[PDB]
User: Fold NAD-dependent protein deacetylase sirtuin-6 from Homo sapiens.
Amino acid sequence: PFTADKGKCGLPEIFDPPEELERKVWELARLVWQSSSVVFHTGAGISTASGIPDFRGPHGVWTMEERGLAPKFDTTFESARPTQTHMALVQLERVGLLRFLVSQNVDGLHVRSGFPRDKLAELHGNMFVEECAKCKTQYVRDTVVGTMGLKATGRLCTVACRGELRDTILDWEDSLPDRDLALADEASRNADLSITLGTSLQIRPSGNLPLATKRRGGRLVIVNLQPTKHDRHADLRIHGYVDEVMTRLMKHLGLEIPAWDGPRVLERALPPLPRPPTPKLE
Ligand SMILES: Nc1ncnc2c1ncn2[C@@H]1O[C@H](COP(=O)(O)OP(=O)(O)OC[C@H]2O[C@H](O)[C@H](O)[C@@H]2O)[C@@H](O)[C@H]1O
Ligand SMILES: NS(=O)(=O)c1cccc(S(=O)(=O)N2CCN(Cc3ccc(-c4ccccc4F)s3)CC2)c1
Ligand SMILES: [Cl-]
Ligand SMILES: [Cl-]
Ligand SMILES: [Cl-]
Ligand SMILES: [Zn+2]
Assistant:
């Protein structure tokens, strides 16, 4: 825990020049249009533009720790707003262009954005979510559950049970929630496109799930400012801010990024909305 391997921290950032970046976002649009089953994989890099530091970026939590400095938050977890990237992912789900969403983020922003929980794997937990040790019933709270490491929060279950409520935040030694990992793995294996956004892909098994898409000739896109463990395996690497990438992608797909209503929980994916017709590609 003190000696936990925190991987490669503070690698230099890469920036694709504008013409190369424009061309790669067009090729990402082409891959989205051609794919039957698209799975997105998100890490800490998609929440940096809302004031939450990443882990291994230049000013990441682990990077700063390694250099004897402190990470900086420009928000509380409760005051954090979903990024343009978060809200793009909401819309891509609503119009049927995203099949499943796998996140290593504990910041609760996917849930609070209104993204449907039945199409989301939270592989490392959710700091707003406590779970009954007895009945396994989950509670999505409006404030952060004040513990980490799957500890008693002090609250009891209110299901018609008085079980011990615990946080869902994995410690270094804790294996992943079985249901979330099973769904994430099935979604990744059956995908013909996996797109990774703001993750360095260094954590097993989370960072390995996008490689499962490469089985049976699936395509892998990696969007990230730094190198990632799997750059070698990517059909397309995009070195740019994820909000710039996703806003230009939505524009190519003819989709608007929806307004955020404030924190809202949606358990189940609503029926698919109309989407624009597909361009002639070939
Ligand atoms: N706006 C941005 N646009 C694009 N890339 C970005 C942006 N901001 C940051 N990045 C990149 O985003 C990447 C974020 O990589 P890491 O910091 O390793 O986060 P993880 O989610 O993969 O960490 C996995 C677990 O490890 C921890 O112990 C926790 O348990 C985590 O759940 C970097 O490479 C940045 O270059
Ligand atoms: N990604 S994010 O936007 O939700 C984010 C970004 C920065 C800081 C936070 S945090 O303040 O809520 N916090 C900082 C300390 N972490 C300790 C860990 C304990 C165990 C860990 C672990 C579990 C399983 C596999 C591998 C692992 F490394 S990581 C927990 C999150 C959240
Ligand atoms: Cl907070
Ligand atoms: Cl909808
Ligand atoms: Cl912890
Ligand atoms: Zn209970």
About this structure: Residues 18-34 form the longest helix (17 residues). The pocket of QTI (ligand 2) is lined by residues 44, 47, 52-53, 61, 105-107, 124, 127, 170-172, 203 (CB under 6 Å). The CA atoms of residues 29 and 253 lie 7 Å apart. The chain has two domains: 17-124+174-269, 125-173.
